[PDB]
Structure formats: C-alpha cells, structure tokens
Amino acid sequence: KHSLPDLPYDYGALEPHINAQIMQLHHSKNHAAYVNNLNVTEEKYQEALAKGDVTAQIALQPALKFNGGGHINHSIFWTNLSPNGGGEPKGELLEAIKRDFGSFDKFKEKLTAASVGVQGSGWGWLGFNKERGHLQIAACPNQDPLQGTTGLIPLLGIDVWEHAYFLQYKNVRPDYLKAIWNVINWENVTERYMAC
Amino acid sequence: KHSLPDLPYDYGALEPHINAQIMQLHHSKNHAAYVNNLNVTEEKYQEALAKGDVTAQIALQPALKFNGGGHINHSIFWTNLSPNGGGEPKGELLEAIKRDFGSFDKFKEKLTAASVGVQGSGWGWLGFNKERGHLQIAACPNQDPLQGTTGLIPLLGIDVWEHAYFLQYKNVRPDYLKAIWNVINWENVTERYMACKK
Amino acid sequence: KHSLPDLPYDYGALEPHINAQIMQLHHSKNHAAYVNNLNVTEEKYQEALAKGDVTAQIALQPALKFNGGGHINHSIFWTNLSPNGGGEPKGELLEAIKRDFGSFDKFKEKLTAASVGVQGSGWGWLGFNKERGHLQIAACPNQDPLQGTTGLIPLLGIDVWEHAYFLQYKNVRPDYLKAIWNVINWENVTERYMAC
C-alpha cells in the first residue's frame, strides 16, 4: 500500500513564508486523505480488473486520478521545499534554465504567470520535456499529475489550490507565489532534473 | 455594465455558521474580482465580435465563462442565505422536495453528497428542470454556471470552493455543509421556484 | 481476455436501413480493434497496479476508457438491432416510456434530438436512472460508456460516430436516425429494462 511520506522538516520550518498551520493541515489532513483514498481505490481496481469489469474500471478513473495524483503531487511538493532553500539552483539546472527561458528571473516570471493563471484548483509546474530535450512550464487542473497526463517529468511544482495559501494570503495568490521562492529546495529540483 | 451587488445583511450576520472574515473576503474580494473581469472580458468580446474575429471570441471563452459564471453564481448565493433563514422550508417548495426526493431530510443528504463529492473547486445546486417539470440536483466545476451549462434553473447553490469555508472548517467540507443549512433563505429559494411554475 | 461477440445476424441483414458495408466494417474492423486494444491496455494496467505505478495507471486511463468503452458500447449496440426489429416495444418498457416521455413518438423525438445534437463523435442513449427509478435520455462523447461515466444503465444506444452512417447517409445524420428505428430490437431493449 502507498504511504504518507514524512516531511523533511517540521510544520513551521517554512515560516514566515508558508505558515505552520497551512503546512500541518496540508500534510496531515489533505495528503493523508489522498493516500488512504488511493489505497481504497487501487484495491477496488484490482477486483474490477480481475473480474474483467470494464465499467467498474472506468467508473473508478476519477477517484484514481484525483487521489493518485494528489499523492504524487504533494509527495514531490514536500521535497521541493526547505527551510534552507531559496536563491537560485547551482549547476546544470541553472544553465538549462538560462538556455530555455533566457534567465532565472524570466523563468520565475513564467512559472508565476502559469500558477497564478490557474482558474480553479490546480498546480503550476516546471517540467522536463524528454521528447524535445528541454525545460517546459505547464499547469494542471485539480490533482491531475504532470507526468501521467502530459508526459513531462515534474521538477518543481507550485500547488495553487486555495488550501495551500488562503489561511495566510487569502485570495492574493500573487503574494503566495512571491513568498514561495524563498523556500524552494533547488537542490532537490536539480536532482530531479539530473535524473532526466 | 455589471456591478457587485450589496449583500442583504452585514458580513457577520451569518455567524456562527459562516464567519465574518469568510463573508467579507468572499464578497468584497472574490465576487468583486469576477465582476471586474466580466466587464473587461465582455468589452473585448464586443470588439472581437464587431471585427469578425472568431479566434479572439473563442480565446475569450474561458475568461467569460469563469468570471461571468462567477458573477452569476455568487449573486444567487448571497440571496440564498439569511440570518433569519434555516429550518425546514414550508409551502409548495417543501411539497415539491418531498415529491422528487422523498422528504426534506433525504433532499439535504442528496445535495450534501453532490456538494461534498466535487473534486476540486465547484458548486452544488438544487435546480429546476423545465423540460421534465421537477427538481434536480447537480454539481458544477469551478465557476461554470448551472443554467448556462446544464439548462437547469438555479434555486439553491452551495459554494464548495475552499475559499467559502477553509478559514473556518479547514478541509472538513462536511461540517461546512452541515452548518450552512442553518442559514439557508428558503423564502428566496421559494421565489426562484415559483418563478419556474410560471 | 475480452472477445469480439458474434453478430446475431449477417452483415447485410439490416439493409436497406444500414447497408452491409457499414455493418461489416463496424464490426470486423472498428469493434475488433477496440477489443484487441482493450486487452493490451488491461494487461498493462495489471503490471502497473502490481508495481504501484500510479503515474502509469493514470497515463493508461484514456486508452482504457476509449477502447474499453468502445467494446461496451458496440457490444450493446449489436444486440439493440435486428433484421426483424422495428415498431414499438411490447409491455412494461412501453408503459415506462409513455410514463416518462408522454408517448413513444415523443421519446423517439427526444433520443433523435440528443443523438443528432452530438458535436463530434459520440453516442445517444436511452438509459435507466436507478437512483430516481425512471428512464432518461443521455449523450456520451467519443466512446465514453454510459454506465461507467453517468451511472445510467444502458438500454438503447445510437452510435453517431460518422463511421456508423457516412457511407450511406453522408453528413445527413438526421436521415440515419430516421432509418434506424426500423431495425431496433425492442425485445432486447425490453430485456435490458426488465433486468433493471
């Protein structure tokens, strides 16, 4: 069965950028539920597959994508952040970013635009296009995961579901986007990029 | 030109069921934003329309539906609530609910389920089906409006976007659904209903 | 593994309403492919499920729904037609239809409207709503199956993908809809209704 990963830092480690309450609820309630729901859903799919029940399989897709994606997305997200993060990546990811976006600030501007642009619940992503061999910005609705729905390998995700910022930033998603750069774990993003 | 309607009560009039900060922000920021963008999008659509720019018209659809829907949904939502609402509805509305759902309690359970089941942002709705002549429950994603996307006439809507309840109920949407029944303005729902029988 | 059902009549049995070529291609090529694709897809899903590969599972949903639905839909469709069909159902389905649509002709008008109204590829359906205990008309895009995506139990489906009528009716879907009533196997639809 899938499991809720531990946080590589405590709930208030990202203060004052993302407050303690947001982190605690996001991980212990939101992500926790996705995992449990995912396990239930995956087990039902095993029964349906074994029975050759195509209708049941299709009927289960929404739950599998939503909770499955919820697990995939947040799992990556936690590793994308750090109390000791911020700044700019060091090395090959930085050169890749300059190459594909002109500069690191233009890139930030682009990911910010995509993230703030999401109508409703969603995610902003910096991903890697293997078919083309370059970085690419993308946005996904609800919990639809980047790789499973677009083929892009996720490097850095920005959760723009209201639960990710409302307590502290209310409706001002732009301020949440501005603040988050201060806690991005570029070493993790770099490692994800190098794994490509 | 569309405008932000005033709430028919103070921001804290629905406490303790829906707190004041939630109402204040939902109204003055959220709703206001939709109306602002709606007027912006409508004008751009008027320019594209007059120029025969079909590509522009199509590119503007998401913004028009999102903000236009946002204006429609919240305008209705404000009137659906009241510091003097709650309780069980009476009159023909109640009789209609018993016919199509069995009882008011069964209806509540049905709308609660449709509302809690929305993945992501959306709305739960009790609407009227003009084609078949009865009540019908439906759910809508993001700000997609009930009538414009399903043909059903909206009677009562429950906003399940997280901004409508997170500050107070966190991720426990079910508690929000349970609390909101205490502030439903059944008199308004009745008026929207009676307006269909016509 | 899933299998292509045999037709309960020959390819030209529905002439002059749906010509022989349409039927032969529809069954031996179109439906045949959906089954094969479905088996491939279902087997990949078994591997992904066993590996706990949520991304692979999600990435496979389109293929499973499309081909799985393709199999479900056409399987029902073949049983919904007959060289000896047409007319009106006899018994409880007829009373159900009068009750829910006023009359059999109003019902035909409704299913026709829904079917002809499909923008792009799709299906028109007469289904049964168990939650409400009544008949209900619905339309589904591409191969999305009725029950798996709406919960309604399929009774009669009208395939409005262009391959289902173009050879004979070209773009005139309304004429195809008019002609098909002559070969509807109402005994099968009735049996599907009674099974509810």
Added chain:
Amino acid sequence: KHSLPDLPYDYGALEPHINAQIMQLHHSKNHAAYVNNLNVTEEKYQEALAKGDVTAQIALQPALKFNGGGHINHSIFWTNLSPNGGGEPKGELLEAIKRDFGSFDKFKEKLTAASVGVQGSGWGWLGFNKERGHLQIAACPNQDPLQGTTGLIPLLGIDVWEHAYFLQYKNVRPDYLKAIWNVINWENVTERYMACKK
C-alpha cells in the same frame, strides 16, 4: 458576415489521394454548415451581449466554438492542399523543420503520430509557437481551433474527422495520412510561417 470560401481547385483536383466525393461533400456540406451556424450563433451572441445576458453568452459557447472553429479549421485546410503540392518543402520552412524536428521525414512521422492518435474527431496541426520562437505539433479535439485554444499559429492542419477520409480509406487513418502528404501545398504553409517571423 462569414462566407464559404471557394476551393482553389476543382473537387477532384486532389485525386487519387483524396477523392472527389470526399472533397465535394467536405466543402459544400460540412464546411458550409459550420459557416451557416457561425453566422446564426454570432448574431445571437450579439443580442445576448447587448442585453447583458451572461447566461445566454455562456450557453452559446459550444455552438460558437464548434462552428466558428469549424470555419477557421477548414478555411485553412483548403489552402494547405493543392494538385501541385506534395514533395518535400524547400526554403526556410524546410530549414525550420530540420531545426525543431531533425529532418522533414521525422517531422512527418511526428505529425502523422499526433494525427493518428486522436481519439474520436479532431485535427493534427503543425503550428508556430510565438512565445518560444519555434515550430510545434499539436492535436485538437472536434473543431476546437488551434490558435484560439492553444495560442499556436496554424501552419498546416490535417483533418482527422472520419468524414475527411472514411469513404476512401475506411478506418485505416494511417493510409489517409500517408496519401495526404502528396497534396500538401508547402508554398501555403511557407507563407503562414513567414507571416510569424514578422
């Protein structure tokens, strides 16, 4: 008012690659229908717009995008074909394709894949990404237009709705994709391309 453009060649000018009955029907019936409905939908949108009827505007979106897109896609499609087309493109267009896809053959394989992979009705497109300055392949469902829904400028589109090939190729879409390369008007694609460098 939108109108049905004339084809720049006779209905059977693309034979034996795309037969005459397919072209005649595709143009005079299919396309004509989209333009007819587009003019109908546009006027209704103008009435709703002027009345501030947001619900109506939203309810009209599917029809506007479907028929408007249908007009846009086919108008471009007709110009993308020619009895004197086919072969490998030359000039800067060819040089651009080699840069972003490797070679013309690899590009063909890519567009063929995107086109054959469309589930249901749709279009395959070679478009220009103004943001990143290069060519890009994309697929669109039903009649959703490339530019209006993705922002990419259409250079070459391949209609994969069954009406575009069924009469001749039946369900073997791959044979249709292989045949259509013999009638591609690379001079037109070049003009649409050159129009972006600007």
